[PDB]
Design a protein around this ligand. Structure first.
Ligand SMILES: NC(=O)c1ccc[n+]([C@@H]2O[C@H](COP(=O)([O-])OP(=O)(O)OC[C@H]3O[C@@H](n4cnc5c(N)ncnc54)[C@H](O)[C@@H]3O)[C@@H](O)[C@H]2O)c1
Ligand SMILES: NC(=O)c1ccc[n+]([C@@H]2O[C@H](COP(=O)([O-])OP(=O)(O)OC[C@H]3O[C@@H](n4cnc5c(N)ncnc54)[C@H](O)[C@@H]3O)[C@@H](O)[C@H]2O)c1
Ligand SMILES: NC(=O)c1ccc[n+]([C@@H]2O[C@H](COP(=O)([O-])OP(=O)(O)OC[C@H]3O[C@@H](n4cnc5c(N)ncnc54)[C@H](O)[C@@H]3O)[C@@H](O)[C@H]2O)c1
Ligand SMILES: [Zn+2]
Ligand SMILES: [Zn+2]
Ligand SMILES: [Zn+2]
Lengths: 333, 333, 333, 333
């Protein structure tokens, strides 16, 4: 029902667009990307190495991108403040370029007529929200918000269930993460983050992520109680979280399984998943969950000290959450 | 000085041979592998996808594998007890087939004239040793010993330094593991371990490992205080250990760095490495250390709860330890 | 209508089974595989790293494999002559183990009551058939036949069109081929084919193939006019043929495009594909064509000397052809 | 002996620097790169995912990059005309940024006092040279030249031997090429070349290359008689050429082997290699040859129609040729 503009037609931009048209929860009416012209958008959206060919129709007609018969205005602006979202009827803008993550930078979309902006990444100052965890804390005074990172959306739902039931005194997270567009095919320049410049195909690359720390924002009680890091590895998609945490109340591993499974079947349905199957990463490709608990993979040293494993399609899960978030916001208007 | 025989000419058998000739600490004089004839041995030893072409000469001559002008007797016996080690002058035998890990089976080499047997893998009932950790516990009454696994050799030296200085109350370990020969190119049968059957190129694959528990043996005080698991990922060589542990005594991260660096420069020199460089996995290709502490990659939530990162060439490092162990044994004769 | 048994429930076995339930052209009533028990078959069939989770239902009940409600008898015989195909009602047997490719070896299935056998690979003496090329040469007197290789099924339909219109004087073919189950994850023993033993993730591996020569069997006029080789590269699925040939009659590239596109829409519909899109290998994953001509990728030096490019899902395309051929065989009974 | 400056410290820039110091054929005295400061240069040059840690010393001292005790002046100029090559003592300048490949653009280095410029890539207008083929056609009047491409340097030497002995009537080339810096980790924008934007790890990507056509310039007699294309595949380094050519004079394959081997041991020593071993791509990592003929991989349909295979380290071979070319220029001077 809410009309949506997308800034940055990349992995997230394109898959948010897919999620939108597949679910019908929001309507994409405009897209901006200076480095992808209209004809190129048809090809990039239609064919996808990771998630296969788009199920539906896409073509260019009269300057518009037409997906499933729905025309979309196409902009080619480098400067976000110059995009005429208002003229196109875009009420919400998905900010998914990755270079406008502050409220100041993302707020440029308001000058073009956008009413609200959703940053598809962590923000230094924008309020972050995770569906199933704190999305009800949103209110209509917030015109610029963040949907956090893919990793945060994996960790937070799980952390909520564990904290709600047993309490997390302290925890340390590792994520084995699929490669992304920011990495390099071969050893190349990355002056700010030297390790991230090394060849992505050849290397396990340790990386710093504020994902664990970010969970402290969407779940205030866990503020300062979580830290983590990442290992980037040569897979095209799907990542996994490794949460090692100390519980303040005792819990058998079966108790943990029970409460997680219960959550996945109820209040966190579609967000937090649960499995006992012998899964590997490819089994979660195009899976729309934010987080899927791997029961068989976890290990318990004692009732107070455990390692919990959760899978996530970093591309497809997060993209769907962006749509869910916007659908929820629209319902409050 | 001591003469060595090698049963099995796989990744380990061949790299023990390389380490032996490169370091010159021992002399290979016999090899046994049914599935590999003499001409093929030259090829497999000379050319290596991971560690490159051998530095030195290798050729067949008079039915002998000649490495660096040193002839080596070859055997093709499927039954270990049928190998004439004594005739070829082999004092120590490196059992590296991986199917004779028990005291009974491994002892078969003795029947042939072998004086001592070194198992290059975990054993269910043979005394396990890790250089730098408990190798001084070796005495001359032991005829059949084990050098534990590649991962145990990475974790134990670090675990020793941390335990000796601050005391590990408890710890959970993750290892991001490069692919191995037991895995499959595409989804194939692995009846006992279903996840391991899945395509190695396509998947992050969780897997069980007894490395953390094995540290309990070589370091008795840590018995029952460590366990862990693995994630197999599509990289060719070099793995990494992720140890999340609670400490009883306070330990600022700078104090951890100090004691590990101190250990790397003194008693554990050559075994436990230390670095503050922005390293990735490939930087440890053909690194001979059992384990190299990654200072920049580790994180501390507080003085009692930390995540410690250590790299290892799961092939090269371990193979050299086997040679080092044999050299230590020879010095005790 | 015709009831089918599958020997060897591997990549081709499982995908032949998928193709059969998806097309409905035949009925799978029995499967044999000593190294995959009933419960394991459920897992291997349901989850696929390459082609995704099975669309439909699969489970074990009453000792039967039940797919979409249809019970399937499961055998665990190593000896082909000991499988009770007749009792299970299997009339045709798909021989897809890779180790019974001669008529003598494949004929063992007749002892257990099978009526005809279709070898899912090249055979040294069994008549080879390729859908769209020579399948109409099949007749009821042939009880054991071969569906050739994936590569042959790609090249032959293309070569047919080119020869029919312009005449191939001579040709040389290269196939850039995805990895398969026969390859190794790391340098391992392969005494018969040394290069094939080398790690499949790290290397481009030149390999021999009789695919081009086999086209001379299914297209007799081209006997002795074609030869080729292969490069194995680190991708999980989908391969491509590179055909360099001399033509007898003048052929503008636009004329080649015309006749190939004509064929793809007419008599070779569903077997030979045609595209002008900017495609890469993943765009053909789970594509059912035997061969898809890549218009933009090909090049013409002159009217008589050209390089033609054709893509194929080596797993999925070939598997459907096996089902197609069996349905055709049944039509001739 | 000749002092050299390097513009652009990328894969080629850095590996030309390695080649220079390893061979000692020229002296690097200056380097320019706006996107890599002094400290970062030390790291990027020392550590290399593909060719391992640099064998020697590297450090920053007094604003200089010091390799093996040799100080090197560092510039950070975006505009090549502003680089004081002269003051730094650099006579020749290797232009290896990939964005100054024209004579007008590369000529900017002369304004800074450089005497000659070698473009480490094909040029639209600068004369191209390939060591072993037409380097003797270089003369002192030429201030701005090109060393062509890696692929041209692989194909031309081979083409020379074949054309000289048997005459190439016509030929078509395919190169299976390892990934490069211009490719993307995941589906991303590549506006002028759509296929090159697709994920490099996931895809076999067909691509255009003027390598075969370029051979016609370094070998005038073959002008218009060759063309080709490339398949990009997910390997970090080492590529292979596949030359399918028709010959005017009869040539048994043994005769082809003979003349190629003969050249590898004589005038083309170090440029054109010859092997009959069962090699795979990784065996040529850090191989300094421009082209190594794979005797066992090639095939002949008849005495006039053959497919010849040749390997090349696209990074290391080319870099050493840049140095050889400069050394040759200096010998004339
Ligand atoms: N890929 C993931 O798994 C993932 C998951 C969660 C969040 N994110 C975050 O989403 C954001 C985008 O990530 P991505 O993977 O889609 O990267 P991407 O490179 O695939 O896409 C980003 C793009 O935005 C375009 N762009 C660049 N500058 C622009 C500008 N000034 N104006 C408009 N468009 C511009 C680019 O052409 C490109 O298409 C990042 O912040 C990322 O951290 C990514
Ligand atoms: N993978 C491809 O792309 C492709 C394409 C065309 C043809 N083929 C051919 O099909 C055949 C199988 O190929 P694949 O890729 O499925 O190999 P695969 O290894 O994936 O499966 C073959 C199997 O047969 C089973 N098996 C082994 N011995 C058996 C026995 N005595 N009895 C019953 N089952 C047994 C194995 O358990 C395994 O499941 C081969 O001949 C192959 O050349 C493969
Ligand atoms: N990589 C190969 O295999 C190969 C083989 C043959 C030829 N080449 C050619 O060599 C050239 C470089 O290729 P590459 O593989 O090293 O890619 P690369 O990305 O690694 O190197 C290009 C670089 O030059 C730097 N640079 C960019 N703009 C600059 C500027 N204005 N001034 C100074 N430095 C600048 C960049 O920091 C970067 O290091 C290309 O033209 C390529 O076609 C590459
Ligand atoms: Zn039932
Ligand atoms: Zn028919
Ligand atoms: Zn010009």
């Amino acid at each position: 029902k809410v009309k949506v503009g997308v800034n940055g037609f990349g992995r997230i931009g394109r898959l948010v667009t897919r999620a939108a048209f597949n679910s019908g929860k929001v309507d994409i009416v405009a897209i901006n990307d200076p480095f992808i012209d209209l004809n190129y958008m048809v090809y990039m959206f239609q064919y996808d190495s990771t998630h296969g060919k788009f199920h539906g129709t896409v073509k260019a007609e009269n300057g518009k991108l037409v997906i499933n018969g729905n025309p979309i205005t196409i902009f080619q602006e480098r400067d976000p403040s110059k995009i005429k979202w208002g003229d196109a009827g875009a009420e919400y803008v998905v900010e998914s370029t990755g270079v406008f993550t502050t409220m100041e930078k993302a707020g440029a979309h308001l000058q073009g007529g956008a009413k609200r902006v959703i940053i598809s990444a962590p923000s230094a100052d924008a309020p972050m929200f995770v569906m199933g965890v704190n999305h009800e804390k949103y209110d209509n005074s917030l015109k610029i918000i963040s949907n956090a990172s893919c990793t945060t959306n994996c960790l937070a739902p799980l952390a909520k269930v564990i904290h709600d039931n047993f309490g997390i005194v302290e925890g340390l997270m590792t994520t084995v993460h699929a490669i992304t567009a920011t990495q390099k095919t071969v050893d190349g320049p990355s002056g700010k983050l030297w390790r991230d410049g090394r060849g992505a195909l050849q290397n396990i690359i340790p990386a710093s992520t504020g994902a664990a720390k970010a969970v402290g924002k969407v779940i205030p009680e866990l503020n300062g109680k979580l830290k983590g890091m990442a290992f980037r590895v040569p897979t095209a998609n799907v990542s996994v979280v490794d949460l090692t945490c100390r519980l303040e109340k005792p819990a058998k591993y079966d108790d943990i399984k029970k409460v997680v499974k219960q959550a996945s079947e109820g209040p966190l349905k579609g967000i937090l998943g649960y499995t006992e199957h012998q899964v590997v990463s490819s089994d979660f490709n195009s899976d729309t969950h934010s987080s899927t608990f791997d029961a068989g993979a976890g290990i318990a040293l004692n009732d107070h000290f455990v390692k919990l494993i959760s899978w996530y399609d970093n591309e497809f899960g997060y993209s769907n959450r962006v749509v869910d978030l916007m659908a929820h916001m629209a319902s409050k208007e």
